[PDB]
Design an enzyme around this catalytic site. Structure first.
Site, PDB file in Angstrom:
ATOM      1  N   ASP A  15       0.763  -1.245   0.000  1.00  0.00           N
ATOM      2  CA  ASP A  15       0.000   0.000   0.000  1.00  0.00           C
ATOM      3  C   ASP A  15       0.805   1.312   0.000  1.00  0.00           C
ATOM      4  O   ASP A  15       0.218   2.353   0.220  1.00  0.00           O
ATOM      5  CB  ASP A  15      -1.136  -0.034   1.053  1.00  0.00           C
ATOM      6  N   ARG A  29       0.964   6.753   0.140  1.00  0.00           N
ATOM      7  CA  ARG A  29       0.144   5.750   0.799  1.00  0.00           C
ATOM      8  C   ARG A  29      -1.239   5.731   0.103  1.00  0.00           C
ATOM      9  O   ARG A  29      -1.883   6.749  -0.104  1.00  0.00           O
ATOM     10  CB  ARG A  29       0.004   6.170   2.289  1.00  0.00           C
ATOM     11  N   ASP A  34      -5.981  -1.099   3.312  1.00  0.00           N
ATOM     12  CA  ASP A  34      -4.931  -1.594   4.183  1.00  0.00           C
ATOM     13  C   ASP A  34      -4.477  -2.955   3.673  1.00  0.00           C
ATOM     14  O   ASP A  34      -5.250  -3.937   3.663  1.00  0.00           O
ATOM     15  CB  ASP A  34      -5.434  -1.668   5.630  1.00  0.00           C
ATOM     16  N   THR A  35      -3.237  -3.014   3.252  1.00  0.00           N
ATOM     17  CA  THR A  35      -2.598  -4.311   3.017  1.00  0.00           C
ATOM     18  C   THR A  35      -1.915  -4.860   4.263  1.00  0.00           C
ATOM     19  O   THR A  35      -1.460  -4.092   5.096  1.00  0.00           O
ATOM     20  CB  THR A  35      -1.568  -4.212   1.877  1.00  0.00           C
ATOM     21  N   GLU A  37       1.194  -6.232   6.462  1.00  0.00           N
ATOM     22  CA  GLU A  37       2.614  -5.827   6.471  1.00  0.00           C
ATOM     23  C   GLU A  37       3.379  -6.988   5.859  1.00  0.00           C
ATOM     24  O   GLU A  37       2.870  -8.127   5.838  1.00  0.00           O
ATOM     25  CB  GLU A  37       3.095  -5.505   7.898  1.00  0.00           C
ATOM     26  N   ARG A  75       3.553  11.331   4.081  1.00  0.00           N
ATOM     27  CA  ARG A  75       3.208  10.535   2.911  1.00  0.00           C
ATOM     28  C   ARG A  75       2.053  11.145   2.158  1.00  0.00           C
ATOM     29  O   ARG A  75       1.103  11.643   2.743  1.00  0.00           O
ATOM     30  CB  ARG A  75       2.841   9.063   3.286  1.00  0.00           C
TER      31      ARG A  75
END
Ligand SMILES: Cc1cn([C@H]2C[C@H](OP(=O)(O)O)[C@@H](COP(=O)(O)O)O2)c(=O)[nH]c1=O
Ligand SMILES: [Ca+2]
Length: 129
Positions: A15, A29, A34-35, A37, A75
């Site tokens: 992401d 971002r 949400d990917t 980690e 970001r």
């Protein structure tokens, strides 16, 4: 919303990506997702998915929403397109990200992404398997 030019500098993970935007290096971002980690289940697969999609594109574009354009870490917050296809959406449709971080006034593509998530979930893909 408007699509603006950018070029890939370097992949990071599922992401986030390092892009050059208005001639400056920035970490972006992806909005509304949400990917996992890299350390987590499906993390490697999300990273790889994003990396391939952005590296193979002849044209990268960034699209800011209506609200804040940078987060507290500096970001960029955007929808990212690879040859016209939205990365954000594609990750969600493949079950490699969850719709997440939906803050008011940066939520233009929320319903589009929730529709992709529903499809991914029905297909039992990846995170939903
Ligand atoms: C996606 C997104 C994340 N963030 C912040 C919220 C989270 O803060 P915390 O770091 O305090 O948890 C973090 C999630 O990013 P990551 O999923 O990249 O870690 O980034 C925003 O502020 N706006 C956004 O649109
Ligand atoms: Ca993440």
């Amino acid at each position: 919303l408007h699509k603006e030019p950018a070029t890939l500098i370097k992949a990071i993970d599922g992401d986030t990506s390092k892009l050059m935007y208005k001639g400056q290096p920035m970490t972006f971002r992806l909005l509304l997702v949400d990917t996992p980690e890299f350390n987590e289940k499906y993390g490697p697969e999300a990273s790889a998915f994003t990396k391939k999609m952005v590296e193979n594109a002849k044209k990268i574009e960034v699209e800011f929403d209506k609200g804040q354009r940078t987060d507290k870490y500096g970001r960029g917050l955007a929808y990212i397109y690879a040859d016209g296809k939205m990365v954000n959406e594609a990750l969600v449709r493949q079950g490699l990200a969850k719709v997440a971080y939906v803050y008011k006034g940066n939520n233009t593509h929320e319903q589009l992404l929730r529709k992709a998530e529903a499809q991914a979930k029905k297909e039992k893909l990846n995170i939903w398997s």
